[PDB]
Symmetry: D2
Subunit: 263 residues, 4 copies
């Protein structure tokens, strides 16, 4: 029912898609009645560290545009001491919501989504970012292609309604409680691909968390990998989910793997 | 994830908004990435009477375009023995969904929505249609303005989900079981406006239906009309909900009423 | 968490099962930790007609105890100008809730439930009651046996939650808008048995109500009765759903029918 | 609709309350129509370690009966190579479900529930059990009194429906990834009491888990303790939530605290 001004241009709000604190995301239309998203952050209560965090993202989000189209596009922004408005691409649905809704995944679409994920994470790695907390919520399906989103410092973004959070955590990040590396995202991505392969994360079955945390770090807990028709798929998952990050496969390695390279 | 061709032009589907049988409505985008709706009817099982019913609507929907913008616009259609595709305006939400979600209504917005409703129903009346079953579901909020929708013969359209039906029935339509007239829509509209005024339909409190049906036809059941700041509002409702259709106010009368004419 | 006194005896409340206005039903335990229900009516606002209605039920409920155990038992009650408390049998679930939850019904259980329904309705008929609004909500599953409940004048009882209403209406009751007879309950019961047979009421498919009301009274709307293994079942339904109440089967007839009498 | 035999005595099932794998809990009635619970474990797939785990619980559950009535009572059991059936007390609701439903808690009821929790945990401690994973789900409200439940080795018990998991984890248990002690339950209990005091767990606000795990172990993350009318309450919480288990208050200490000892 409402509207907003970013850098002179007027946008009419269709619906609130999601929110965190003090952030909200809207699906909007521009003067040409074209579909975009606008992220709104209320700064009225933000401390220095947090201000800096939102500045860093906008900056990286700007820089990364040029180097890959598998990062959500930012078109324009207004930023004051009171508020941020960022005009952005609007996808169809996030990967997490989508995975929960899905009967099953077509091997072609899985492989294709895998390529997009690799490219995105490979990209942030080349620019010195190591996410360390990747999850399905960090990907947006836009025109059949996944793009990285919500990849910044403190990003508790969740869909809204009109009425796992640890299954992806890499082992080295647990033990560490100087020891988080690019390899940690490989774990997390592997967990997502495992999900897309077996309909479940490697420890979705363990519902107590002390017990689940234990299982992730424990090498005498053999993870299961039932045989499937795609042997390459099977080897990628096996290499992604090696607990010793040093023996875990790298992103540049994964991009040379037959699973992604051979038709 | 999908797409469709109507009269040469390609449309990509965002989401299914609603359905009946064998109809479905989609929110789609055109080649210029602009937002529209497409109604799809599957004819594979339609009998003559039903075929005729869908033809009548498309025809009326076409004719009524020229005479009022408070009827949903049809832009183009493809019709075969197998299917109908109609490209149409896409509103924000239907009135029924909206009323259920709403805290309360701003008197200005109520009055404005009332004007739109009158104009729409007045329009169909001038073209020999007498709906006889009007309800909140028959109105679509498009850019702050209500437009008549789903007003055709057999139209069981309902919103879809990702997981009253008699409060509006006019008394003469009950007794009749040669006796349905324009006045019957005045009743129904009054019931909607009563809802928008008092947060409830005149017999929402009576949940048994034999009992509710009885109450609608019974003149010794005084309907309540608590005093409000808007006396004109109070008189319109009182005149709309007179049980004797002959003593009920007409649409051309209602358009001259101070409630709609005086600021 | 609470407790209550009826005629000297103390009852502790387990949970609220359901409510209307100004009535509520509780699942309670007695001093011997045995399971009962207590219906509570708040009289603080009851008019004479309504007072009388609640008195009539308690009276009939008392009288009918002696003549059939397919009417819910009342054990004791306290009644003042302020409140009624009735201590009653507590069943497992009502028939309506149960039907909505059910995969499918075992022919033996259907037939058995049919016998109980007939006996109950036959009973009220012998005592000059003609319900005229029977529905699945009017039956309570208690130890594998249906018992009639909520059969009194103004009884808008509905289950509570921790977070059709016209499919059963007999045709003569519609036309009548001196003409309601025992036969009307036969219709309604038939509709319930039809539901238990075909998974659906005879006009569950017609969702518009003007249209559904029309269909119930219209003799050129042939109701469907797909062949099933139980031909007796098929004939009972056909005889219950005859629109001319005079040509409709009677309860004493139905009790002599092979469906209920032959193993 | 069904029934079961434990040690000769027949029990009729009212409803399934909850389940895990391969366990289920039922609300049942005995031959005297009195209300009990029955826990059913299907052993058809249990490995030695798990068999042993279920044996240990039944044994402890038996022994602890004699020493405190704030542990759920076991009355009788049948145990074979195929199944376990345990007849048990049936409470009203578990603490977790109850806390989620609650407007707010009466200080008297909070204190009383606190006493019960202390007594229960104190009891298991005297018998060499150190739970190490206490949570609201581990307590059952039975006749206004909390009793410890589901306190055994692998107990993933969850309520069923007819349609946090880490907020309680003690810091020493995180760092430990020879170092879990009685003090760890004091943490967890404190977190529950904090919840009952402030409507929220100390880190319910941090929704990312890497971040929440970090916060629990981090001493430069001052936990908040807004002043309340009950200063004793304030000191208990402060003493329970000290991160250095050595400087954390003990159960025998907590039982001498003015909060529990002075009216
Ligand atoms: C209609 O567009 C969307 C719909 C949905 N959902 C439909 C409802 C269902 O329950 C699942 C979520 C989810 C995502 C989108 N598209 C979308 N575009 C851009 C962003 C964004 N999300 N989000 C969503 C906010 C919550 C999750 C993703 C955050 C990333 C971002 O910066 N932007 C701009
Ligand atoms: C995003 O667009 C809409 C969203 C909603 N809802 C959001 C979900 C919520 O639960 C309530 C319903 C409801 C209506 C629209 N817009 C809309 N435009 C055109 C038509 C149409 N509806 N519908 C909807 C189908 C179900 C009710 C109206 C039928 C009328 C029609 O011919 N067309 C083309
Ligand atoms: C646990 O006992 C019950 C549970 C349920 N439900 C479980 C919840 C689910 O969503 C469906 C309803 C439904 C009925 C019962 N048992 C029951 N006994 C006696 C009466 C009674 N109902 N009710 C229920 C109140 C709402 C419907 C029936 C009214 C009839 C009556 O006078 N009494 C005393
Ligand atoms: C009617 O009795 C109950 C109802 C509920 N709920 C009502 C539904 C609502 O959504 C929340 C849960 C919860 C607990 C009980 N009573 C109850 N007694 C004994 C055990 C037990 N639970 N449970 C429940 C199973 C799931 C949580 C507790 C496990 C502990 C145990 O060994 N026994 C025997
Ligand atoms: Mg949702
Ligand atoms: Mg929903
Ligand atoms: Mg919805
Ligand atoms: Mg329910
Ligand atoms: Mg529940
Ligand atoms: Mg529920």
């Amino acid at each position: 029912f409402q509207s907003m001004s970013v850098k002179g241009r007027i946008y009419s709000i269709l619906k609130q898609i999601g929110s965190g604190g003090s952030s909200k995301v809207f699906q909007v239309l521009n003067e040409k009645k074209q579909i975009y998203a606008i992220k709104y952050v209320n700064l009225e209560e933000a401390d220095n560290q947090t201000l800096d965090s939102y500045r860093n993202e906008i900056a990286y989000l700007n820089k990364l545009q040029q180097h890959s189209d598998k990062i959500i596009r930012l078109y324009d922004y207004e930023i004051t001491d009171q508020y941020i408005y960022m005009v952005m691409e609007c996808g169809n649905i996030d990967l997490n919501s989508w995975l929960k809704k899905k009967k099953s995944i077509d091997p072609w679409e899985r492989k294709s989504y895998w390529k997009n994920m690799l490219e995105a994470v490979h990209t942030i790695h080349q620019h010195g970012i190591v996410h360390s907390d990747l999850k399905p919520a960090n990907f947006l399906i836009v025109d059949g292609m996944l793009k990285l989103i919500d990849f910044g410092i403190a990003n508790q973004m969740q869909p809204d309604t009109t009425s796992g959070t640890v299954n992806y955590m890499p082992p080295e990040a647990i033990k560490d409680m100087s020891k988080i590396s690019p390899k940690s995202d490989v774990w997390s991505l592997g967990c997502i691909l495992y999900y897309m392969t077996y309909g479940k994360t490697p420890f979705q079955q363990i519902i107590n968390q002390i017990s689940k945390l234990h299982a992730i770090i424990d090498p005498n807990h053999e993870i299961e990998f039932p045989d499937i028709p795609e042997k390459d798929l099977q080897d990628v998952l096996k290499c992604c989910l090696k607990r010793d990050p040093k023996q875990r496969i790298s992103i540049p390695e994964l991009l040379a793997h037959p699973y992604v390279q051979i038709q």
